Design a protein around this ligand. Sequence first.
Ligand SMILES: *[C@@H]1O[C@H](CO)[C@@H](O)[C@H](O)[C@H]1NC(C)=O
Ligand SMILES: *[C@@H]1O[C@H](CO)[C@@H](O)[C@H](O)[C@H]1NC(C)=O
Lengths: 162, 264
Amino acid sequence: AHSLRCNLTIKAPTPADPLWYEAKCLVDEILILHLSNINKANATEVGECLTQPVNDLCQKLRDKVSNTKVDTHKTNGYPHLQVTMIYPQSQGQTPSATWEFNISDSYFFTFYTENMSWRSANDESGVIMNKWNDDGDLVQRLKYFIPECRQKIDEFLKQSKE
Amino acid sequence: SYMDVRIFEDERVDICQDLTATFISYREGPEMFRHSINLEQSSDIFRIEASGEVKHFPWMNVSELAQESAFFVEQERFVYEYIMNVFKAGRPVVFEYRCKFVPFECTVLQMMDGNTLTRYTVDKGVETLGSPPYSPDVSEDDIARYGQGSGISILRDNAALLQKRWTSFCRKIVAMDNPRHNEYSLYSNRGNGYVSCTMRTQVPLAYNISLANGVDIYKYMRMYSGGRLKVEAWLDLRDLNGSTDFAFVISSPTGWYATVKYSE
Ligand SMILES: *[C@@H]1O[C@H](CO)[C@@H](O)[C@H](O)[C@H]1NC(C)=O
Ligand SMILES: *[C@@H]1O[C@H](CO)[C@@H](O)[C@H](O)[C@H]1NC(C)=O
């Protein structure tokens, strides 16, 4: 129930809305971290530790989105990306994160850090996934995201539950 | 302790000759810039986060950084006009000025979304190296012309003063650089088979961390508030193929390197 949850949105900026990334990390209702390009406690310490790995990941995901070949939503335009990081996953043997990708409500895939495995919702999702799947830097960022702040995170999740 | 750190020094390398300062400006959003300066073999010596946070070292007087501050003030204006007049959407962009002070010479790089679009050398023209992914309405001509960058006169008209100030900062770095003053640590996570190696230091050099046998690791650097730096790397055992003997090698452009590993 009370785990670390991070929500990332990556979209094209407009003159009306100049936001192209936003990150919220939550432990239950309490907001650990809120980041965006527009602006921006054991909880303050976790938030501080996650700040850089989050910024750099968001920048990196936009790079990936910009250079990648997505045609669905009828190639409506620049794709919209939602990412959900959950730690710890319920079905893990050892505590590990999952990373859930939604591109434009068309493509859905998930990375399981425990066994470095990827899974998609469907065939067309698998194509995109497998192209991301071999961006080594990407994979390593995802894999070593939680390990960077592990102690601060685990300790905080332990104090919640009290 | 539990780990042993062996330090290898052959000949100290003086990295302060042919001084070359890189001024980087990254526009992230409306009035949101990250500015940074570094030397050719250094990590960032001066940095302004988009949050407004100013990161520097205690031996620097930031108030004395009038010219560079003025340069970055110019980049903020310049990049704002460029974005509004040409792109019209506030997509992120980076400008990189790599400058030699004596003899004065700049190279200007422009990047969007991990891609280098233009290289401006004053001898050559603007060389176009790439195009930005979602820019059908924007002309190559316009991108190239903005690839010239702005504000270089602030740097040129003050070259001798900048050469002096940055040579002084470089020499201070060389002077403080002592592998024995840094703190080294290892962590093993038994649950997931990861090992991290960490070096904390107050000396902003472009350190390289890698593993002795060549196996890839994930590495990065972090800069904090008080002149504090962190070099960190991650190993996944089982990239070692059953083995359990490894060493992290941390190397400094000044010519020393340290091995960090576990023993008995
Ligand atoms: C440099 O810092 C000192 C304080 O250490 C300050 O008094 C001075 O005004 C700053 N710069 C200049 C040019 O004086
Ligand atoms: C770091 O190692 C890479 C090879 O992995 C090498 O090409 C690079 O020059 C090294 N950097 C330094 C500063 O030694």
